Scaffold this motif. Structure first.
Motif, short mmCIF file in Angstrom:
data_model
loop_
_atom_site.label_atom_id
_atom_site.label_comp_id
_atom_site.label_asym_id
_atom_site.label_seq_id
_atom_site.Cartn_x
_atom_site.Cartn_y
_atom_site.Cartn_z
N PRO A 148 7.40 6.29 -1.49
CA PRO A 148 8.20 5.06 -1.33
C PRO A 148 8.39 4.70 0.14
O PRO A 148 8.83 5.53 0.94
CB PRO A 148 9.53 5.40 -2.01
CG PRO A 148 9.26 6.62 -2.83
CD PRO A 148 8.18 7.37 -2.12
N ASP A 149 8.07 3.45 0.48
CA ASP A 149 8.18 2.95 1.85
C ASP A 149 7.39 3.80 2.83
O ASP A 149 7.76 3.94 4.00
CB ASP A 149 9.64 2.85 2.29
CG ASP A 149 10.35 1.67 1.67
OD1 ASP A 149 9.67 0.71 1.25
OD2 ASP A 149 11.60 1.70 1.59
N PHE A 150 6.29 4.38 2.36
CA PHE A 150 5.33 5.05 3.24
C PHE A 150 3.95 4.67 2.73
O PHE A 150 3.53 5.11 1.65
CB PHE A 150 5.52 6.56 3.25
CG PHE A 150 5.29 7.19 4.59
CD1 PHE A 150 4.00 7.49 5.01
CD2 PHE A 150 6.35 7.48 5.43
CE1 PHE A 150 3.79 8.07 6.25
CE2 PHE A 150 6.14 8.06 6.66
CZ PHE A 150 4.85 8.36 7.07
N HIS B 138 11.16 -9.71 6.10
CA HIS B 138 12.02 -9.14 5.06
C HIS B 138 11.88 -7.63 4.94
O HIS B 138 12.82 -6.97 4.47
CB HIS B 138 11.70 -9.79 3.71
CG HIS B 138 10.24 -9.74 3.35
ND1 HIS B 138 9.33 -10.66 3.83
CD2 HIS B 138 9.54 -8.88 2.58
CE1 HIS B 138 8.13 -10.37 3.37
NE2 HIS B 138 8.23 -9.30 2.60
N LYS B 139 10.75 -7.05 5.35
CA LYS B 139 10.49 -5.65 5.05
C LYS B 139 9.39 -5.12 5.95
O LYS B 139 8.55 -5.87 6.46
CB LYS B 139 10.10 -5.47 3.58
CG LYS B 139 9.86 -4.03 3.16
CD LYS B 139 11.14 -3.22 3.18
CE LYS B 139 10.91 -1.80 2.69
NZ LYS B 139 10.49 -1.78 1.26
N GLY B 140 9.42 -3.81 6.14
CA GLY B 140 8.37 -3.10 6.86
C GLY B 140 8.54 -1.62 6.64
O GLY B 140 9.62 -1.14 6.30
N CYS C 2 0.80 -1.22 0.00
CA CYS C 2 0.00 0.00 0.00
C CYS C 2 0.84 1.27 0.00
O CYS C 2 0.30 2.35 0.27
CB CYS C 2 -0.96 0.00 1.19
SG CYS C 2 -0.19 -0.16 2.82
N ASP C 3 2.13 1.19 -0.30
CA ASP C 3 2.90 2.39 -0.55
C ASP C 3 2.80 2.73 -2.03
O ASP C 3 1.93 2.21 -2.75
CB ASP C 3 4.34 2.21 -0.06
CG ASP C 3 5.08 1.11 -0.81
OD1 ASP C 3 4.42 0.18 -1.32
OD2 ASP C 3 6.32 1.18 -0.87
N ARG C 4 3.66 3.63 -2.52
CA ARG C 4 3.63 4.04 -3.92
C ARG C 4 5.06 4.22 -4.42
O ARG C 4 5.74 5.18 -4.02
CB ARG C 4 2.82 5.32 -4.11
CG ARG C 4 2.46 5.61 -5.56
CD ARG C 4 1.51 6.78 -5.65
NE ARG C 4 2.13 8.02 -5.21
CZ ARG C 4 1.49 9.17 -5.04
NH1 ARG C 4 0.19 9.27 -5.25
NH2 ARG C 4 2.17 10.25 -4.65
N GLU C 5 5.50 3.33 -5.31
CA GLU C 5 6.87 3.39 -5.81
C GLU C 5 7.07 4.49 -6.85
O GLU C 5 8.17 5.04 -6.96
CB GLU C 5 7.27 2.04 -6.41
CG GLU C 5 7.02 0.84 -5.49
CD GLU C 5 7.78 0.93 -4.18
OE1 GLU C 5 8.71 1.76 -4.07
OE2 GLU C 5 7.44 0.17 -3.25
N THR C 6 6.03 4.83 -7.62
CA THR C 6 6.12 5.86 -8.64
C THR C 6 5.00 6.87 -8.46
O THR C 6 3.83 6.48 -8.32
CB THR C 6 6.06 5.25 -10.05
OG1 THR C 6 4.87 4.47 -10.18
CG2 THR C 6 7.28 4.37 -10.30
N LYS D 32 10.74 -5.42 -3.60
CA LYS D 32 11.25 -5.47 -2.24
C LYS D 32 10.14 -5.53 -1.20
O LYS D 32 10.37 -6.03 -0.09
CB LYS D 32 12.16 -4.26 -1.98
N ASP D 33 8.94 -5.05 -1.54
CA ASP D 33 7.79 -5.10 -0.65
C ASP D 33 7.09 -6.45 -0.66
O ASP D 33 6.28 -6.72 0.23
CB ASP D 33 6.77 -4.03 -1.03
CG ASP D 33 7.26 -2.64 -0.76
OD1 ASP D 33 8.16 -2.48 0.08
OD2 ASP D 33 6.73 -1.70 -1.40
N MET D 34 7.37 -7.29 -1.64
CA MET D 34 6.62 -8.52 -1.83
C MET D 34 7.37 -9.70 -1.22
O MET D 34 8.58 -9.65 -0.98
CB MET D 34 6.37 -8.75 -3.32
CG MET D 34 5.59 -7.61 -3.96
SD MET D 34 5.24 -7.88 -5.70
CE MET D 34 4.66 -6.26 -6.18
CA LIG Z 1 8.32 0.01 -1.12
#
Ligand SMILES: [Ca+2]
Ligand SMILES: N[C@H](C(=O)N1CCCC1)C1CCN(c2nccc3c(-c4ncc(Cl)cc4Cl)cccc23)CC1
Ligand SMILES: [Ca+2]
Ligand SMILES: [Ca+2]
Ligand SMILES: [Ca+2]
Length: 650
Positions: A376-378, A356-358, A155-159, A179-181
């Motif tokens: 990104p990452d938010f 792996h990620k958060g 649920c973040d936004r890479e682009t 990286k989020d998956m």
């Molecule tokens: Ca991300």
């Protein structure tokens, strides 16, 4: 070799079958025997183990033996393999049938085998690396000894080009999205091709189709492309089989948080399918399954270290900005400003975490996505439209970690303002309460906030850490503390002290005038009963004693609905930056050019190592009618305790 599979020899004909490692065959030789046949012998190749089983007792048979057994329905073969076939493989079992007469076989039934390895692998042991065929990969269990792969809601936004979070579509535009998956690897071993009539298929249920997205990276060594193979409107996917030792890497994204009727668990399957004929469904002769738990949304209590402070207000609220800037400069935090309390009542910073990620995830409940947030990452999750004032992040709090009657809540407990069961009063909407409960890990508790006009728990309670310890304090508004202080200052000869000094829009309000107001006294005695009713719930549900509670003076005025609104700014609703507290400036009676409410709060908190800064969020308006028009929100470091190590109640 653990799952038993029935493969019968066919009368006279030869049977060719794919053998999946991890299984073994029970093989009927009796039904294929010609009529009158009395005994059978068998041959088999080197990489096929064959046992004759005669009433439950198994005997290992050599490859090329001349031994004969009496034909019986209760005498069968158990056929097992441990290595996958190659191109040079001729894995076979051959049964010869003899009549009572001679020793030359009268017929022959054959089983021809192609052994392949199939295994859908995930990181069920939660170390960020996809181990080989974790035996518990099809289940999900809580605790430090539990296992099962974890999945993030993407649920973040890479682009920034597209407006909605990544999981809103069935596309991946940036490889940073991967990286989020969670990684899911289809591991296989076998010959160049599957025998005629077989195919490998990945699939999900229709129900899970809006819960996950599954992607495959095509042409990774040049211009990369990402193919959506399972998820919305894609329930299955035929896998292109590669011979030898092959791994197919898939990336899985979560699309949906746990909620009412969705527990967070999703399943992905791989099946080896056999083509039976046209118009017949393909038979699943082998199925492997992996389960994911979608990570819950977690809220961060005030005891967690602050990372950055988000502030919303007007452009000319200079005193507020200056004092919030001064406060944040005593700390290591970043300050982010946006140019009424929506940053505190409409927005809430939580987080999600997998092994792996958060990253942080903000939930937005309007009463447009804040641009200085999603990215990104938010993560950013907005409420679906279509409530009372109790539907507000101001009516939500989260406690520090607590232990209650031996039951630990390592991530604290969410607190929700509500009304009494038989009251007919207001209540947070069921969808919100159900969603918070569905996250499980912060076992929510309902408090009593409907005695307040606005109806928010942050009007009367808060938590601060005790500097230099692992302990915390509950701060409670207290009208009795306020009357005690005022009667003291009146006895000390300060009854004529004026309240709200520095607010030109405000009445000539003095201590004497407040203490002589009988109606106001009765009102605040009742409001103290409401506060104490909450005090009792908090102590019970959070494991608190009276030693963990500080009462901050407060005063309320009752409205036509018999609900309370702050007489002066509620000091309990403060910015907690570790030892540094940003406390709403009360504008109380001034005793010796100093607010006596300020000096009292300092006397309560400073001896504990807490540093008090009083923030003026009303002077720009020239008066106080019970409303704060400025908001702040703190993004905090997540708990070090991993949520999946918890054991929630069933
Ligand atoms: Ca991300
Ligand atoms: N499908 C969505 C989802 O998982 N995704 C959509 C985008 C990608 C991932 C779910 C999000 C959560 N949804 C909510 N359900 C209850 C409440 C909510 C609130 C709220 N609003 C006010 C308060 Cl006080 C407390 C809360 Cl939690 C805010 C915001 C959303 C909410 C249910 C649908
Ligand atoms: Ca692992
Ligand atoms: Ca996407
Ligand atoms: Ca993403």
């Amino acid at each position: 070799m653990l799952r038993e599979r029935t493969v019968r020899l066919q009368y006279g004909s030869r049977v060719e079958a794919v053998y999946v490692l991890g299984t073994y065959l029970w093989t009927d030789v009796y039904s294929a025997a010609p009529a009158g046949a009395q005994t059978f012998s068998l041959k088999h190749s080197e990489h096929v183990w064959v046992e004759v089983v005669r009433d439950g007792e198994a005997e290992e048979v050599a490859t090329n033996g001349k031994q004969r057994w009496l034909l019986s329905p209760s005498t069968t073969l158990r056929v097992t393999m441990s290595q996958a076939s190659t191109e040079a493989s001729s894995d076979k079992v051959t049964v010869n049938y003899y009549d009572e007469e001679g020793s030359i076989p009268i017929d022959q039934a054959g089983l021809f085998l192609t052994a392949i390895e199939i295994s859908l692998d995930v990181d069920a042991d939660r170390d960020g690396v996809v181990e080989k065929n974790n035996p518990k990969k099809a289940s999900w269990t809580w605790g430090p000894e539990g296992q099962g792969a974890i999945l993030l809601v993407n649920c973040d936004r890479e682009t920034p080009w597209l407006p909605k979070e990544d999981c809103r579509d069935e596309k991946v535009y940036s490889k940073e999205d991967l990286k989020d998956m969670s990684q899911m690897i289809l591991r296989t071993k076998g010959p160049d091709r599957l025998p005629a009539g077989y195919e490998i298929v990945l699939y999900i249920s229709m129900s899970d189709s809006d819960k996950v997205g599954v992607f495959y990276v095509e042409n990774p060594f040049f211009g990369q492309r990402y193919i959506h193979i399972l998820g919305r409107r894609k329930l299955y996917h035929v896998v292109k089989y590669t011979g030898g030792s092959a791994e197919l890497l898939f990336f899985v994204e979560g699309l949906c948080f746990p909620d009412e009727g969705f527990s967070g668990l999703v399943s992905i399957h791989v099946s080896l399918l056999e083509y039976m004929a046209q118009d017949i469904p393909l038979t699943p002769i082998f199925t492997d399954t992996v389960i994911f738990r979608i990570a819950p949304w977690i809220m961060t209590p005030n005891i967690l270290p602050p990372v950055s402070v988000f502030v919303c207000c007007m452009k000319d609220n200079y005193l507020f900005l200056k004092e919030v800037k001064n406060l944040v400069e005593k700390t290591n935090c970043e300050l982010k400003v946006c140019f009424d309390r929506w940053i505190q009542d409409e927005i809430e910073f939580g987080y999600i975490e997998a092994p792996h990620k958060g990253f942080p995830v903000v939930l937005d409940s309007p009463r447009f996505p804040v641009k200085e947030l999603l990215g990104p990452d938010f993560g950013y999750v907005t409420r679906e439209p279509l409530v009372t004032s109790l539907d507000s992040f101001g009516n939500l709090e989260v406690s520090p970690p607590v232990t209650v009657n031996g039951k630990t809540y390592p991530l604290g407990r969410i607190l929700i303002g509500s009304s009494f069961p038989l009251s007919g009063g207001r209540r947070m909407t069921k969808v919100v309460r159900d969603f918070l409960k569905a996250q499980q890990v912060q076992a929510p508790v309902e408090l009593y906030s409907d005695w307040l006009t606005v109806g928010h728990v942050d009007e009367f309670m808060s938590f601060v850490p005790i500097p230099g310890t692992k302990k915390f304090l509950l701060l409670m508004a207290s009208t009795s503390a306020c009357y005690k202080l005022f009667r003291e200052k009146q006895k000390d000869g300060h009854g004529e002290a004026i309240m709200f000094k520095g607010l030109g829009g405000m009445k000539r309000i003095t201590i004497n005038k407040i203490l002589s107001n009988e109606s106001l006294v009765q009102e605040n005695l009742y409001f103290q009963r409401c506060l104490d009713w909450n005090r009792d719930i908090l102590k019970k549900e959070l494991g608190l004693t009276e030693q963990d509670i500080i009462d901050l003076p407060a005063l309320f005025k009752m409205d036509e609905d018999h609900r309370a609104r702050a007489f002066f700014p509620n000091m309990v609703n403060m910015i907690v930056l570790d030892k540094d507290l940003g406390i709403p400036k009360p504008f109380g009676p001034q005793v010796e050019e100093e607010c006596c409410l300020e000096m009292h709060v300092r006397g309560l908190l400073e001896p504990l190592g807490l540093e008090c800064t009083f923030i003026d969020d009303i002077s720009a308006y020239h008066k106080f009618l019970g409303e704060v028009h400025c908001g702040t929100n703190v993004r905090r470091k997540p708990f070090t305790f991993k949520w999946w190590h918890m054991v929630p109640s069933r």
